[PDB]
Design a protein around this motif. Sequence first.
Motif, PDB file in Angstrom:
ATOM      1  N   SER A 167      -7.471   6.730   1.694  1.00  0.00           N
ATOM      2  CA  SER A 167      -6.349   5.563   1.630  1.00  0.00           C
ATOM      3  C   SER A 167      -6.038   5.534  -0.059  1.00  0.00           C
ATOM      4  O   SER A 167      -6.811   6.078  -0.822  1.00  0.00           O
ATOM      5  CB  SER A 167      -6.986   4.284   1.990  1.00  0.00           C
ATOM      6  OG  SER A 167      -8.007   3.790   1.257  1.00  0.00           O
ATOM      7  N   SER A 168      -5.150   4.807  -0.216  1.00  0.00           N
ATOM      8  CA  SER A 168      -4.985   4.315  -1.649  1.00  0.00           C
ATOM      9  C   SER A 168      -6.042   3.596  -2.364  1.00  0.00           C
ATOM     10  O   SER A 168      -6.104   3.811  -3.660  1.00  0.00           O
ATOM     11  CB  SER A 168      -3.527   3.562  -1.861  1.00  0.00           C
ATOM     12  OG  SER A 168      -3.951   2.152  -1.098  1.00  0.00           O
ATOM     13  N   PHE A 219     -16.669  -1.774  -8.319  1.00  0.00           N
ATOM     14  CA  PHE A 219     -17.385  -3.119  -8.618  1.00  0.00           C
ATOM     15  C   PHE A 219     -18.687  -3.149  -8.134  1.00  0.00           C
ATOM     16  O   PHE A 219     -19.704  -3.714  -8.540  1.00  0.00           O
ATOM     17  CB  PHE A 219     -16.660  -4.358  -7.827  1.00  0.00           C
ATOM     18  CG  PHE A 219     -15.334  -4.558  -8.255  1.00  0.00           C
ATOM     19  CD1 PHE A 219     -14.278  -3.904  -8.001  1.00  0.00           C
ATOM     20  CD2 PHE A 219     -15.243  -5.804  -9.178  1.00  0.00           C
ATOM     21  CE1 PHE A 219     -12.985  -4.137  -8.546  1.00  0.00           C
ATOM     22  CE2 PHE A 219     -13.947  -6.190  -9.697  1.00  0.00           C
ATOM     23  CZ  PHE A 219     -12.830  -5.464  -9.624  1.00  0.00           C
ATOM     24  N   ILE A 246      -8.487  -8.571  -7.843  1.00  0.00           N
ATOM     25  CA  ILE A 246      -8.604  -8.303  -9.354  1.00  0.00           C
ATOM     26  C   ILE A 246      -7.899  -7.179  -9.978  1.00  0.00           C
ATOM     27  O   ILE A 246      -7.243  -7.012 -11.112  1.00  0.00           O
ATOM     28  CB  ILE A 246     -10.295  -7.789  -9.569  1.00  0.00           C
ATOM     29  CG1 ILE A 246     -11.064  -9.036  -8.993  1.00  0.00           C
ATOM     30  CG2 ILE A 246     -10.432  -7.691 -10.944  1.00  0.00           C
ATOM     31  CD1 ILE A 246     -10.950 -10.240 -10.101  1.00  0.00           C
ATOM     32  N   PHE A 265      -9.063   3.947 -11.898  1.00  0.00           N
ATOM     33  CA  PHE A 265      -9.624   2.965 -12.759  1.00  0.00           C
ATOM     34  C   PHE A 265     -10.956   3.711 -13.617  1.00  0.00           C
ATOM     35  O   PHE A 265     -11.438   3.037 -14.539  1.00  0.00           O
ATOM     36  CB  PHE A 265     -10.022   1.661 -12.104  1.00  0.00           C
ATOM     37  CG  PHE A 265      -8.604   0.876 -11.724  1.00  0.00           C
ATOM     38  CD1 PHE A 265      -8.330   0.236 -12.901  1.00  0.00           C
ATOM     39  CD2 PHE A 265      -8.192   0.686 -10.399  1.00  0.00           C
ATOM     40  CE1 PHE A 265      -7.067  -0.415 -12.942  1.00  0.00           C
ATOM     41  CE2 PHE A 265      -7.009   0.058 -10.232  1.00  0.00           C
ATOM     42  CZ  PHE A 265      -6.506  -0.421 -11.367  1.00  0.00           C
ATOM     43  N   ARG A 321     -17.622  -7.078   4.296  1.00  0.00           N
ATOM     44  CA  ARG A 321     -17.700  -6.145   2.974  1.00  0.00           C
ATOM     45  C   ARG A 321     -17.052  -6.987   2.083  1.00  0.00           C
ATOM     46  O   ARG A 321     -16.360  -7.721   2.062  1.00  0.00           O
ATOM     47  CB  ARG A 321     -16.836  -5.061   3.267  1.00  0.00           C
ATOM     48  CG  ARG A 321     -17.051  -3.903   2.069  1.00  0.00           C
ATOM     49  CD  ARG A 321     -16.147  -2.813   2.444  1.00  0.00           C
ATOM     50  NE  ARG A 321     -14.736  -3.281   2.748  1.00  0.00           N
ATOM     51  CZ  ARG A 321     -14.037  -3.318   1.766  1.00  0.00           C
ATOM     52  NH1 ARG A 321     -14.147  -3.287   0.312  1.00  0.00           N
ATOM     53  NH2 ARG A 321     -12.645  -3.696   2.073  1.00  0.00           N
ATOM     54  N   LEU A 322     -17.959  -6.631   0.720  1.00  0.00           N
ATOM     55  CA  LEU A 322     -17.320  -7.575  -0.625  1.00  0.00           C
ATOM     56  C   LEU A 322     -16.131  -7.067  -0.667  1.00  0.00           C
ATOM     57  O   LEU A 322     -15.762  -5.868  -0.826  1.00  0.00           O
ATOM     58  CB  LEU A 322     -18.313  -7.415  -1.617  1.00  0.00           C
ATOM     59  CG  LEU A 322     -19.767  -8.166  -1.541  1.00  0.00           C
ATOM     60  CD1 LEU A 322     -20.296  -7.731  -2.861  1.00  0.00           C
ATOM     61  CD2 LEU A 322     -19.601  -9.373  -1.416  1.00  0.00           C
ATOM     62  N   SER A 323     -15.144  -7.736  -1.092  1.00  0.00           N
ATOM     63  CA  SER A 323     -13.637  -7.445  -1.704  1.00  0.00           C
ATOM     64  C   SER A 323     -13.500  -7.960  -3.075  1.00  0.00           C
ATOM     65  O   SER A 323     -13.554  -9.087  -3.254  1.00  0.00           O
ATOM     66  CB  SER A 323     -12.962  -7.929  -0.535  1.00  0.00           C
ATOM     67  OG  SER A 323     -11.652  -6.900  -0.881  1.00  0.00           O
ATOM     68  N   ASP A 370       0.789  -5.372   3.181  1.00  0.00           N
ATOM     69  CA  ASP A 370      -0.672  -5.602   3.697  1.00  0.00           C
ATOM     70  C   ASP A 370      -0.831  -6.991   3.090  1.00  0.00           C
ATOM     71  O   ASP A 370      -0.691  -7.294   1.978  1.00  0.00           O
ATOM     72  CB  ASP A 370      -1.684  -4.545   2.749  1.00  0.00           C
ATOM     73  CG  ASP A 370      -2.874  -4.898   3.088  1.00  0.00           C
ATOM     74  OD1 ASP A 370      -3.216  -5.159   4.417  1.00  0.00           O
ATOM     75  OD2 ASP A 370      -3.912  -4.770   2.242  1.00  0.00           O
ATOM     76  N   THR A 419      -9.521   3.544  -6.890  1.00  0.00           N
ATOM     77  CA  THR A 419     -10.888   3.495  -7.370  1.00  0.00           C
ATOM     78  C   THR A 419     -11.018   4.618  -8.526  1.00  0.00           C
ATOM     79  O   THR A 419     -11.652   4.318  -9.619  1.00  0.00           O
ATOM     80  CB  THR A 419     -11.838   3.688  -6.449  1.00  0.00           C
ATOM     81  OG1 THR A 419     -11.818   2.396  -5.643  1.00  0.00           O
ATOM     82  CG2 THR A 419     -13.394   3.792  -6.915  1.00  0.00           C
ATOM     83  N   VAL A 464       0.757  -1.169   0.031  1.00  0.00           N
ATOM     84  CA  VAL A 464      -0.055   0.042   0.115  1.00  0.00           C
ATOM     85  C   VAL A 464       0.672   1.212   0.139  1.00  0.00           C
ATOM     86  O   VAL A 464       0.530   2.114  -0.866  1.00  0.00           O
ATOM     87  CB  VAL A 464      -1.008  -0.014   1.125  1.00  0.00           C
ATOM     88  CG1 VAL A 464      -1.709   1.198   1.119  1.00  0.00           C
ATOM     89  CG2 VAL A 464      -1.830  -1.333   1.331  1.00  0.00           C
TER      90      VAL A 464
HETATM   91  C1  LIG Z   1      -9.936  -2.729 -11.385  1.00  0.00           C
HETATM   92  C2  LIG Z   1      -9.899  -2.663  -9.844  1.00  0.00           C
HETATM   93  C3  LIG Z   1      -9.580  -3.755  -9.094  1.00  0.00           C
HETATM   94  C4  LIG Z   1      -9.505  -3.916  -7.928  1.00  0.00           C
HETATM   95  C5  LIG Z   1      -9.772  -2.880  -7.052  1.00  0.00           C
HETATM   96  C6  LIG Z   1      -9.690  -2.948  -5.683  1.00  0.00           C
HETATM   97  C7  LIG Z   1     -10.679  -3.271  -4.616  1.00  0.00           C
HETATM   98  C8  LIG Z   1     -10.677  -3.289  -3.336  1.00  0.00           C
HETATM   99  C9  LIG Z   1     -11.861  -3.810  -2.642  1.00  0.00           C
HETATM  100  O1  LIG Z   1     -11.737  -4.211  -1.637  1.00  0.00           O
HETATM  101  O2  LIG Z   1     -12.802  -4.136  -3.433  1.00  0.00           O
HETATM  102  C10 LIG Z   1      -9.440  -2.910  -2.734  1.00  0.00           C
HETATM  103  N1  LIG Z   1      -9.321  -2.850  -1.337  1.00  0.00           N
HETATM  104  C11 LIG Z   1      -7.985  -2.388  -1.286  1.00  0.00           C
HETATM  105  N2  LIG Z   1      -7.336  -2.066  -0.242  1.00  0.00           N
HETATM  106  C12 LIG Z   1      -5.939  -1.535  -0.425  1.00  0.00           C
HETATM  107  C13 LIG Z   1      -5.443  -1.010   0.998  1.00  0.00           C
HETATM  108  C14 LIG Z   1      -4.971  -1.760   1.933  1.00  0.00           C
HETATM  109  C15 LIG Z   1      -4.748  -1.101   3.291  1.00  0.00           C
HETATM  110  C16 LIG Z   1      -4.828   0.242   3.280  1.00  0.00           C
HETATM  111  C17 LIG Z   1      -5.294   0.996   2.586  1.00  0.00           C
HETATM  112  C18 LIG Z   1      -5.696   0.354   1.125  1.00  0.00           C
HETATM  113  N3  LIG Z   1      -7.458  -1.901  -2.741  1.00  0.00           N
HETATM  114  C19 LIG Z   1      -8.449  -2.528  -3.542  1.00  0.00           C
HETATM  115  C20 LIG Z   1      -8.492  -2.334  -4.880  1.00  0.00           C
HETATM  116  C21 LIG Z   1     -10.251  -1.377  -7.674  1.00  0.00           C
HETATM  117 CL1  LIG Z   1     -10.445  -0.275  -7.062  1.00  0.00          CL
HETATM  118  C22 LIG Z   1     -10.246  -1.405  -9.290  1.00  0.00           C
END
Ligand SMILES: Cc1ccc(-c2cc(C(=O)O)c3nc(NCc4ccccc4)[nH]c3c2)c(Cl)c1
Length: 347
Positions: free
Chosen positions: A259-260, A309, A207, A268, A201-203, A67, A265, A58
Amino acid sequence: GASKLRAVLEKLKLSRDDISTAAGMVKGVVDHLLLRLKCDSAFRGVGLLNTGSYYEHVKISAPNEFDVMFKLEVPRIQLEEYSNTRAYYFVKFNPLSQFLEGEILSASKMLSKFRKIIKEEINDIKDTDVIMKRKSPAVTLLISEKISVDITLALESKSSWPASTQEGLRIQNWLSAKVRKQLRLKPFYLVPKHFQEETWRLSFSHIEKEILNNHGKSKTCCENKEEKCCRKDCLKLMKYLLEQLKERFKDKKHLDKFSSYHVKTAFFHVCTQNPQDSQWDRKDLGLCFDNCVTYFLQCLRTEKLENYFIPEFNLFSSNLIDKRSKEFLTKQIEYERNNEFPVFDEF
Ligand SMILES: Cc1ccc(-c2cc(C(=O)O)c3nc(NCc4ccccc4)[nH]c3c2)c(Cl)c1
Ligand SMILES: [Zn+2]
């Protein structure tokens, strides 16, 4: 001009070989944790999300903050959407029956044993110094004095993605409908929420690697010098900008909720907005980076950043982040944008 931005990316590229030393410490810790958990009645099917990856980084500026995600396959899983939030669900149905509060699966009761087993093993071996930090869902360890690792537990489901994702992952005009169909055949994950409920929460974080490593409309994007794009560089600069802004104001609480993930998000969403590789030419790094900065500010001012998503889940809603926080970030980025980003020539 891309002159400043490239030098930032060149400075960032240098500290990549520092991760190689720190990551090796992380592997030994989580290899010991996976074998202790796998012989527990509840965590028999535990493992890393990616068999050899072992992490996600991260902090693109600090190579000492990892992470890590552990997965647990929950077959024949039944989900109930919690009050039309589209992203939080109850898990109902077995190795996990010891965490059942009747029909539903208790997240905090599963996190208790998970944190307990890790706490006991962290002290048990301790051939290298690992320190546990308690504070929300992530089991945060600290290896030696620098390296910190966030361990997240996730439930894995190999069934169809929940209905709330039906119009998410809008990549058809960019990566094609064939690729969107193939990606949606992959599993999805549920993570602890930590108002208050025993919801998950859905994650879809797994991807991200799939798309970042295959990211152009052209299949040969970034495979030769004739079609080298700056998509990845723009994402790195977006993440670094927030990390510097969160570091600069760490004595306040205004930027603690960003956050990042939000930066990812919005990026993309821009990729959906700009599907052609010609819109991401390397020579236009400064211009393309501005498109990302502009969109993120438009999100900040409009209080709207859709989950990539789950289009009906607003990451920038007032329930999640208050207006004064988003206005504070809007001012700081607009100031940095007008000033050619002073946070980039320093650390
Ligand atoms: C095309 C696409 C593919 C994948 C993602 C994506 C989805 C999720 C999710 O939870 O759905 C997700 N979570 C995280 N955490 C990162 C984090 C961890 C700890 C501290 C701060 C940040 N980074 C994510 C990325 C997105 Cl935005 C676009
Ligand atoms: Zn590319």
